[PDB]
Ligand binder design. Structure first.
Ligand code: CLA
Ligand code: CLA
Ligand code: CLA
Ligand SMILES: CC(C)=CCC/C(C)=C/CC/C(C)=C/CC/C(C)=C/CC/C(C)=C/CC/C(C)=C/CC/C(C)=C/CC/C(C)=C/CC/C(C)=C/CC1=CC(=O)C(C)=C(C)C1=O
Ligand SMILES: CC(C)=CCC/C(C)=C\CC/C(C)=C\CC/C(C)=C\CC/C(C)=C\CC/C(C)=C\CC/C(C)=C\CC/C(C)=C\CC/C(C)=C\CC1=CC(=O)C(C)=C(C)C1=O
Ligand SMILES: CCCCCCCCCCCCCCCCCC(=O)OC[C@H](CO[C@@H]1O[C@H](CO)[C@H](O)[C@H](O)[C@H]1O)OC(=O)CCCCCCCCCCCCCCCCC
Ligand SMILES: CCCCCCCCCCCCCCCCCC(=O)OC[C@H](CO[C@@H]1O[C@H](CO)[C@H](O)[C@H](O)[C@H]1O)OC(=O)CCCCCCCCCCCCCCCCC
Ligand SMILES: CCCCCCCCCCCCCCCC(=O)OC[C@H](CO[C@@H]1O[C@H](CS(=O)(=O)O)[C@@H](O)[C@H](O)[C@H]1O)OC(=O)CCCCCCCCCCCCCCC
Ligand SMILES: CCCCCCCCCCCCCCCC(=O)OC[C@H](CO[C@@H]1O[C@H](CS(=O)(=O)O)[C@@H](O)[C@H](O)[C@H]1O)OC(=O)CCCCCCCCCCCCCCC
Ligand SMILES: CCCCCCCCCCCCCCCC(=O)OC[C@H](COP(=O)(O)OC[C@@H](O)CO)OC(=O)CCCCCCCCCCCCCCC
Ligand code: HEM
Ligand code: OEX
Ligand SMILES: [Cl-]
Ligand SMILES: [Fe+2]
Lengths: 113, 262, 334, 37, 49, 31, 175, 35, 137, 57, 57, 93
């Protein structure tokens, strides 16, 4: 689907911090260029400072099939922040094999084990 | 049980006996009165206690996936002795062509649960919160009835978190235990939106209390009520079921003291 | 020559396949009741409102659990440590809603293991053997009473006892660590020493006895058949094992006496498990493990973290996430 | 419960094959003991 | 529960088994006891049954 | 359906325990 | 080491690992064997003296068993249904249990080296995702693991420079 | 509920009385060294 | 770094004047804080009313502002609500209410000074720990 | 069913009312899928596994 | 539903369940012991007792 | 609710949504927490801040404080999920 550039409300480029392999579940936080936290997907919405609603973020896609598309609603920004947490964002067929949405190990890991 | 008898009992006697959940009643000896609403005197309800004695749930007549016919069914209580509502109080005002009681306090809700034949559990919030009751006269006496509609809040509030840490006012906004499902760029976890999107929805109900005993000396009244409301929705995941409660009611009418701060 | 005398002879008979005795009179019915109710509740039981907040938790196989996740859920927190038999419930359905089977199973099982202690003493008396195997059994029982009974008493709720399952056992562990810091509590450390040393001495003793077995067997035959049941002679050379272990470390360390050796074998794990059971009994009343958080500060006075602080972070994560909907106030005093 | 389907075969056959192996090893041995006498 | 009845006896019916079953057991035990040599002894325990 | 397998395995373990307790090889002293 | 224990639990859910279960079974069973064997041997000792303290009544070089195997076998057979009848089997068993436990748990930790972890039961995760009233102690353990990870990562992995605001930290009501 | 209560009371009293009057029936003598 | 005077200089009055606490003063202030109010105010929080902590943000936004030694010391004898309209001496430890709060009976003016110095010194020691709560333990 | 609706029609009812009085169970019996002579030797399982679970008439 | 052995219970008396339902369609308020579940448990217990008697013989 | 566009005004921004904000947020504005916020939350649903000033029963000093902090205050559509938790939302510290 292409690279999701995260243009904040003004136009600064946010980036979603990537999930480390250790973490089964990682919070979605959008660090700045220097990396001070700018926006995130809050767990507790009350008294939220760095919500994407408050800061204001838009997802502009570059490359891929979703190229040249500029989504600027908060919901659709959040949905692709969740995807950008996992690195590059891709489309998947989960019906051919009835996939269950939990990651597996490659032959490298199974050989190693 | 009369109010005169509750005063006689100490807490040690009443504790652990189930009498605390039981709604009082006006004695037959002290009855036939008339709680007249004098003008130039603001009146209010107090101690409006409602004990439901029978619980019924509108269950589908069959487990067919398209079943539209439903009949109310007898239910037995999983929770024990928490059902009664006590202390409800409110101002009596001339909002419209007749007097009306506005609910503004008290315990005024009970998060009870029942089980139907077949073993299905229905939780519901038996409540009269925000009731707008209308008296059937300008004077409370035997045969007078107070009835109206009320707004039942959600069984779970926003701060409640489901087993996967999802709530209305807080919690995860995704099924964190399925990152591969959220990895998809086309749909993601859109299928689980109904369960992930926790919605606080306030439902409607109606109550019809009928006062069969009234006393002018104490301002007390007692009788029976039938109330209709909706059951728990699990923040919009479930479809609400209709709950029909019936039982007894006690209450008192006094003059507003100016310190109530309604 | 009296009916009561014949009954007492039969009960105290050393000819029954399984000895009953007078402690068995109390053990067998209680343990059988606990087994029956546990099996029935584990295979099929409705969800239980453990936390007293009308949020039932499933523990039975029929309600979507496996052997690892299945459990007999602790009682409801609304009950507290009130006695909750079947006859104190308005109906059996609401008895199962508030986790009464846990109370039934725990009470019957605790009485049964007490009867097992007494029955172990009893048979020994009939045998003419010395007592005290019973004393060793107490250490496992003490731990079971600490987790199933004393911890509810101290905390004031049978919801706080350990669930009768595998995943529930892990849950009880993590909550106990979050609330009490059992790992830093020295009695649990003594228990860890007890179990690790029990494994060490078991492996060592088995290795040395198996290593010095006297040759009584051919090459096409298992060495175990070199020992005949009820023989008078020793099946291995104590001198050889003792000398090998003396050369391994130093002569003075080895137990040249076999009776002292076996007393030490019976002593180390029993005392360790006694201490950890007592530690759980004391943390029931909130005498927690050590709290070295923010114990190192620089000259200015700002906290330099230690491993205690990093452990505190995990304890704090478990503390905040446990029972998410049960707490309405900042302190976890209950 | 969306459980696997070959897990049934895995569990049942991984229990069955060793169990019948042990039962055969016991029956063979006993038969031989009886035949010796 | 939490009412404070002695031995949980809220109904008077509960006492009939609680008092009688020990009494039948006591009666059966008395036949054993009356058959014993009930004189004193100077020992740690009685070896006579 | 997995409850069938779980129950069968637990019952089989209990049966093995029963047969081990009550149909053990009787200990006897050699000569 | 305590921090390692809780870190491995929070990030791998190592208690759910069946190989860890086999290992703790081996350890606790070995402690059990040690305790029962010590008690049984000390309590079926033959009367080889007239002193109440029976430790001195053993000679290292004696060719006689100092305790009754037959009496211990009778005791444990009629108390527990089964009992050792062979000393050599008993002492090999005492060896095998802890060693087997350690090797089994080693297999589990080798699995955890590659993040090949028995973290979750997928069936229950899917059911709880589609059924927000389905709760098990397993799901509570998963929530506790999430709490451990999120509240531990910032101070436990300072090289990562994790700044988790209070908004994103997974919490519960009140505490 | 009361029927179950009295049945459980009957059973508990029966076994407790058996235990009580059994250990009271000169249990100390039931050892292999008697006489 | 040492406990230099830059750390030990705290605001004294509302105008902006500062005062350099002595090491004896900060030691006594820490001991007095932990002994007299640590039970509720451990870590710069308020256990009984967590809406109002001892972090400098809350003290500065109080009416009167309590981000100085004189204002804190006045609070320890004339405590008031967060808006400074009602006296809470009957619900708060104060030297004027020490009979019902027996921990404030022995405190002198220098003790109150040291306690205020400890309160104002803490936030300089940590960026977020003082009044941060569990999140920064 | 035919004689029931016929005597209903003779009572003055119309086809809609006459057929509405026929119980769903009786109409369910008058259906070939309920016939035992329609299954198969290796078509295994409940009858609901074939045509389906009957919902309405 | 492919209920093979249950109709033989229902044929000669056992029409109720401990779960509060009946094959006749009515809802049972106070089911007795001899329900479907009770009959099943009784048969299992008889199986165990007969097994023990077989061992003794 | 995976989306709630009025989150910024719940206590995290410079503007406070009066209708469904917890009392704690008024600690940010000096002189309003214990007394003024009680009357703000009592008659919580307001059409706008003007109706709040008219309806809130404020004393003259309270009106002066509210005149100071008018630009920090707004009144959006009441949210039931947030109004129920306007005095105690479980957020302590
Ligand atoms: C390698 C690391 C390690 C080690 C060695 C231990 C060791 C121990 N932990 Mg653990 N623990 C660990 C890590 C570790 N822990 C961590 C990281 C945490 C933090 C989360 C904890 C938190 C923790 C807690 C909170 C507790 C323990 C406890 C224990 C003890 C459990 C064994 C026991 O007491 O059995 C003794 C024996 C028994 C409990 C069994 C009773 C047996 C009964 C009497 C009979 C049962 C009969 C049965 C039902 C039927 C038989 C069937 C028949 C067919 C055969 C032991 C000292 C527990 C303890 O000390 O309990 C007192 C305890 O409460 N640990
Ligand atoms: C009943 C409770 C229980 C029990 C019995 C165990 C048992 C075990 N756990 Mg633990 N564990 C528990 C609960 C429990 N766990 C819980 C609840 C958790 C989750 C919080 C964990 C988390 C956990 C982890 C993360 C790991 C274990 C591991 C182990 C194994 C440790 C083996 C050992 O003895 O290492 C002791 C160490 C050794 C034997 C190594 C060699 C030691 C040499 C010989 C020492 C020589 C010292 C020398 C003389 C110098 C001394 C100097 C002096 C100054 C000190 C063992 C199977 C480990 C494992 O699985 O390993 C495969 C492991 O990594 N557990
Ligand atoms: C004569 C007695 C009898 C009868 C009339 C029925 C009748 C029924 N049973 Mg069955 N059942 C029986 C005995 C009987 N059962 C026994 C003894 C058992 C215990 C094992 C079961 C276990 C059982 C279950 C678990 C279920 C049923 C169900 C059913 C229904 C569907 C039948 C079906 O699909 O068959 C299908 C039959 C076949 C595909 C094979 C039939 C043809 C022959 C006999 C094959 C012979 C092959 C031969 C042995 C060679 C094999 C070689 C090998 C190497 C592969 C039906 C009401 C189902 C139901 O609806 O339950 C609610 C269901 O789920 N039954
Ligand atoms: C509805 C139902 C049934 C519910 C059940 C639900 C539930 C949660 C299920 C539990 C599932 C369960 C069983 C899973 C267990 C899985 C698990 C982790 C298995 C571990 C297996 C594994 C391969 C581990 C490797 C380590 C291993 C070898 C351990 C073995 C442990 C073991 C058996 C140790 C011995 C224990 C023991 C009781 C010894 C008793 C010995 C005894 C009788 C002493 C006798 C004796 C002593 C003397 O000294 C002398 C002198 C004499 C003469 C003498 O006789
Ligand atoms: C560094 C370094 C080498 C440290 C060693 C520490 C040290 C002195 C350990 C001693 C441990 C200990 C007390 C040993 C006794 C344990 C024991 C039961 C072992 C088994 C055993 C011991 C014998 O002594 C004999 C004789 C036989 C038979 C036998 O099994
Ligand atoms: C031992 C130390 C622990 C302290 C135990 C407290 C002792 C108090 C005993 C009175 C108990 C009581 O009143 O029952 C009261 C409770 C049950 O009583 C409850 O009472 C409630 C209101 O009071 C309600 O009525 C409940 O229905 C009823 O269950 O007793 C029990 O919990 C059951 C007793 C189990 C006894 C086990 C038998 C022990 C085996 C040997 C017994 C020793 C025999 C010695 C012979 C001499
Ligand atoms: C070694 C033991 C194994 C022996 C070999 C097996 C023998 C044959 C047994 C039939 C196996 C069925 C294979 C089909 C699998 C399947 O999909 O169906 C599986 C079906 C059940 O079918 C399932 O039922 C479930 C319950 O509701 C659900 O409805 C499922 O949707 C439905 O598929 O199994 C049977 O119906 C078992 C029938 C048992 C045999 C009874 C036949 C009548 C006896 C005649 C007497 C012999 C006379 C000569
Ligand atoms: C402090 C207590 C000091 C008194 C101990 C007395 C005693 O134990 O004697 C009993 C025997 C006598 O020894 C045996 O004592 C014999 C002499 S005697 O008859 O016993 O006096 C002697 O012949 C033999 O060689 C000797 O090993 O002592 C031992 O053999 C081992 C004692 C070990 C005790 C310390 C270990 C504690 C483990 C705690 C576990 C925590 C986990
Ligand atoms: C065996 C002796 C049982 C006598 C009681 C008979 C009875 O009516 O209750 C039977 C009850 C539930 O009944 C039923 O249990 C129902 C609960 S439920 O529907 O199964 O969830 C309950 O609602 C109903 O009133 C009740 O009758 O079932 C049992 O508890 C029996 C299982 C235990 C058997 C132990 C055998 C040990 C050997
Ligand atoms: C009144 C109360 C009565 C309750 C009694 C209950 C007793 C339970 C019996 C268990 C023994 C099981 C068979 C063991 C196997 C067996 O037959 O062993 C019999 C074996 C006899 O060995 P011998 O020394 O005779 O063997 C020498 C020969 O092997 C030659 O090499 O004795 C032991 O090793 C038993 C000690 C371990 C006993 C613990 C065994 C593990 C128990 C765990 C059971 C699993 C529970 C899971 C259920 C899902
Ligand atoms: C030496 C003694 C104490 C000192 C110096 C002290 C300090 C303070 C300060 C400065 C405040 C105001 C915080 C702010 O404005 O944000 C405060 C408030 C408060 N303190 Fe303390 N305190 C002391 C003892 C205690 C103890 C022991 C308790 C409780 C057990 C307590 C409970 C409270 C409460 C309830 C308030 C009232 C806040 C309000 O209503 O505005 N304090 N304290
Ligand atoms: O429930 Mn079981 O658990 Ca002992 O703490 Mn308080 O309450 Mn709940 O919390 Mn943490
Ligand atoms: Cl709370
Ligand atoms: Fe040995």
């Amino acid at each position: 689907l292409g690279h999701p550039i995260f243009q904040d409300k003004e136009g600064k480029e946010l980036t979603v911090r990537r999930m480390p392999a250790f973490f089964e579940t990682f919070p979605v936080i959008l660090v700045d260029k220097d990396g001070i936290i700018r926006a995130d997907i809050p767990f507790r919405r009350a008294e939220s400072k760095y919500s994407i609603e408050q800061v204001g973020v838009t997802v502009s896609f570059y490359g891929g099939k979703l190229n040249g598309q500029v989504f600027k609603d908060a919901p659709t920004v959040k949905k692709y922040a969740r995807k950008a947490q996992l690195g590059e964002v891709l489309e998947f067929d989960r019906t051919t094999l009835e996939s269950d949405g939990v990651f597996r190990s490659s032959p490298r890991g199974w050989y190693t084990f | 049980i009369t109010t005169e008898d509750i005063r006689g009992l100490t807490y040690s006697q009443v504790k652990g006996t189930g009498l605390a959940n039981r709604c009082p009643e006006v004695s037959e000896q002290n009855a036939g009165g008339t709680i007249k609403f004098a003008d130039d005197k603001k009146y209010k309800v107090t101690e409006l206690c409602l004990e439901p004695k029978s619980f019924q749930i509108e269950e589908e007549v069959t487990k067919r996936r398209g079943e539209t016919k439903k009949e109310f069914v007898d239910t037995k209580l999983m929770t024990r002795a928490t059902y009664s509502l006590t202390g409800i109080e409110g101002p009596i005002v001339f909002k419209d062509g007749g007097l009306t009681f506005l609910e503004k306090g008290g315990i005024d809700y009970a998060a009870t649960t029942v089980q139907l034949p077949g073993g299905e559990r229905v939780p519901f919030l038996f409540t009269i919160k925000e009731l707008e009751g209308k008296f059937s006269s300008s004077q409370v006496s035997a045969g007078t009835e107070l009835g109206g509609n009320f707004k039942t809040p959600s069984y779970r509030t926003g701060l409640f978190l489901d087993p996967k840490g999802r709530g209305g006012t807080t919690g995860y906004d995704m099924a964190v235990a399925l990152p591969g499902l959220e990895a998809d760029g086309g749909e993601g976890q859109d299928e689980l939106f109904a369960e992930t999107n926790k919605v606080f929805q306030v439902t409607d109900g109606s109550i019809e209390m009928a006062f069969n005993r009234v006393d002018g000396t104490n301002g007390e009244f007692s009788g029976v009520f039938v109330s209709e409301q909706l059951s728990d929705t699990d923040m919009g995941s479930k479809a609400p079921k209709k709950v029909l409660l019936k039982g007894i009611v006690f209450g008192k009418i006094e003059e507003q003291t100016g310190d109530e701060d309604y | 020559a009296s009916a009561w005398e014949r009954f007492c002879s039969w009960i105290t008979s050393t000819d029954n396949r399984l000895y009953i005795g007078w402690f068995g009179v109390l053990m067998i019915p209680t343990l059988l009741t606990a087994t029956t109710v546990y099996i029935i509740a584990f295979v099929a039981a409705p969800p239980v409102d453990i936390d007293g907040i009308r949020e039932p938790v499933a523990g039975s196989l029929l309600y979507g659990n496996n052997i690892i996740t299945g459990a007999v859920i602790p009682s409801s927190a609304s009950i507290g440590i009130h006695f909750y038999p079947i006859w104190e419930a308005a109906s059996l359905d609401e008895w199962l809603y508030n986790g009464g089977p846990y109370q039934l199973i725990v009470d019957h099982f605790l009485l049964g293991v007490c009867g097992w202690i007494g029955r172990e003493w009893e048979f020994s008396y009939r045998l003419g053997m010395r007592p005290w195997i019973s004393v060793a059994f107490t250490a496992p029982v003490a731990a079971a009473s600490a987790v199933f009974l004393v911890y509810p008493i101290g905390q004031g709720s049978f919801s706080d006892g350990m669930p009768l399952g595998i995943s529930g056992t892990f849950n009880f562990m993590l909550v106990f660590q979050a609330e009490h810091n059992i790992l830093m509590h020295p009695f649990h450390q003594l228990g860890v020493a007890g179990v690790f040393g029990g494994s060490l001495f078991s492996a060592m003793h088995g290795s040395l006895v198996t290593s010095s077995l006297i040759r009584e067997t051919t090459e096409n035959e298992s060495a175990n058949y070199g020992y005949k049941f009820g023989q008078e002679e020793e099946t291995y050379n104590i001198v050889a094992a003792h000398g090998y272990f003396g050369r391994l470390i130093f002569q003075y360390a080895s137990f040249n006496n076999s009776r002292a050796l076996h007393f030490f074998l019976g002593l180390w794990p029993v005392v360790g498990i006694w201490f950890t059971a007592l530690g759980v009994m004391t943390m029931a009343f909130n005498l927690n493990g050590f709290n070295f958080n923010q114990s190192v500060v620089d000259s200015q006075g700002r906290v330099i973290n230690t491993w205690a602080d990093i452990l505190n972070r995990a304890n704090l994560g478990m503390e905040v996430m446990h029972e998410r909907n049960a707490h309405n106030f900042p302190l976890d005093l209950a | 419960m969306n459980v696997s389907v070959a897990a049934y075969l895995a569990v049942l056959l991984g229990t069955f094959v060793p169990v019948v192996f042990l039962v055969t090893l016991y029956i063979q041995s006993e038969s031989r003991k009886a035949g010796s006498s | 529960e939490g009412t404070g009845e002695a031995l949980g006896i809220d109904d008077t019916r509960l006492i009939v088994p609680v008092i009688l079953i020990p009494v039948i057991t006591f009666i059966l035990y008395a036949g054993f006891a009356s058959e014993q040599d009930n004189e004193d002894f100077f020992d740690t325990y009685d070896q006579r049954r | 359906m997995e409850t069938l397998v779980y129950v069968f395995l637990l019952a089989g373990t209990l049966g093995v325990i029963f047969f081990a307790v009550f149909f053990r090889d009787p200990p006897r002293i050699a000569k | 080491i305590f921090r390692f224990l809780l870190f491995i639990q929070g990030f791998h859910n190592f208690t759910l690992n069946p190989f860890h279960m086999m290992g703790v079974a081996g350890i606790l069973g070995a402690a059990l064997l040690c305790a029962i064997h010590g008690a049984t041997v000390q309590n079926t000792i033959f009367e080889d003296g007239d002193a109440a303290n029976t430790f001195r009544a053993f000679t290292p070089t004696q060719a006689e068993e100092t305790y009754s195997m037959v009496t211990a076998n009778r005791f444990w057979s009629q108390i527990f249904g089964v009992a050792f009848s062979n000393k050599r089997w008993l002492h090999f068993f005492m060896l095998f249990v802890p060693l087997a436990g350690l090797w089994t748990s080693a297999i589990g930790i080798v699995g955890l080296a590659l993040n090949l972890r028995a973290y979750d039961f997928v069936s229950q995760e899917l059911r709880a995702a589609e059924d927000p009233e389905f709760e098990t102690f397993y799901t509570k353990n998963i929530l506790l693991n999430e709490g451990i990870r999120s509240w531990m990562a910032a101070q436990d992995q300072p090289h990562e420079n994790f700044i988790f605001p209070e908004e994103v930290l997974p919490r519960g009501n009140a505490l | 509920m009361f029927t179950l209560k009295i049945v459980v009371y009957t059973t508990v009293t029966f076994f407790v009385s058996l235990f009580t009057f059994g250990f009271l029936s000169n249990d100390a003598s039931r050892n292999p060294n008697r006489k | 770094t040492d406990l230099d005077e830059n750390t030990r200089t705290v605001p004294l009055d509302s105008s902006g004047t500062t005062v350099i606490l002595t090491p004896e003063q900060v030691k006594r202030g820490k001991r007095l804080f932990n002994s007299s109010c640590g039970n509720c105010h451990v870590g710069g929080i308020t256990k009984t009313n967590p809406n109002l902590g001892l972090e400098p943000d809350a003290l500065s936004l109080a009416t009167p502002a309590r981000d100085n030694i004189d204002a804190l010391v006045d609070y320890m004898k004339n405590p008031t609500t967060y808006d400074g309209l009602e006296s809470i001496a009957e619900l708060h430890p104060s030297v004027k209410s020490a009979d019902i709060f027996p921990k404030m009976r022995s405190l002198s003016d220098e003790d109150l000074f040291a306690i205020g110095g400890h309160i104002l010194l803490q936030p300089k020691l940590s960026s977020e720990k003082w009044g941060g709560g569990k999140i920064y333990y | 069913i035919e004689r029931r609706v016929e005597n209903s029609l003779n009572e003055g009812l119309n086809l809609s009312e006459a057929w509405s009085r026929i119980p769903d169970k009786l109409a369910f019996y008058d259906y070939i899928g309920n016939n035992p002579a329609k299954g198969g030797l290796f078509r295994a399982g409940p009858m609901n596994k074939g045509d389906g679970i009957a919902e309405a008439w | 539903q492919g209920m093979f052995v249950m109709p033989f219970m229902a044929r000669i008396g056992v029409t109720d369940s401990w779960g509060g339902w009946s094959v006749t369609g009515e809802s049972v308020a106070n089911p007795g012991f001899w329900s479907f579940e009770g009959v099943a448990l009784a048969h299992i217990g008889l199986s165990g007792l007969l097994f023990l008697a077989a061992v003794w013989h | 609710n995976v989306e709630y566009p009025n989150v910024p005004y719940l206590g995290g921004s410079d503007i406070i949504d009066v209708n469904n904000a917890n009392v704690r947020v008024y600690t940010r504005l000096p002189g309003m927490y214990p007394a003024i916020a009680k009357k703000i939350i009592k008659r919580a649903p307001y059409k706008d801040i003007n109706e709040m000033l008219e309806k809130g029963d404020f004393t003259a000093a309270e009106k002066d404080i509210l005149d100071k902090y008018l630009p920090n205050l707004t009144a959006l559509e009441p949210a039931p999920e947030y109004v129920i938790d306007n005095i105690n939302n479980g957020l302590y510290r």
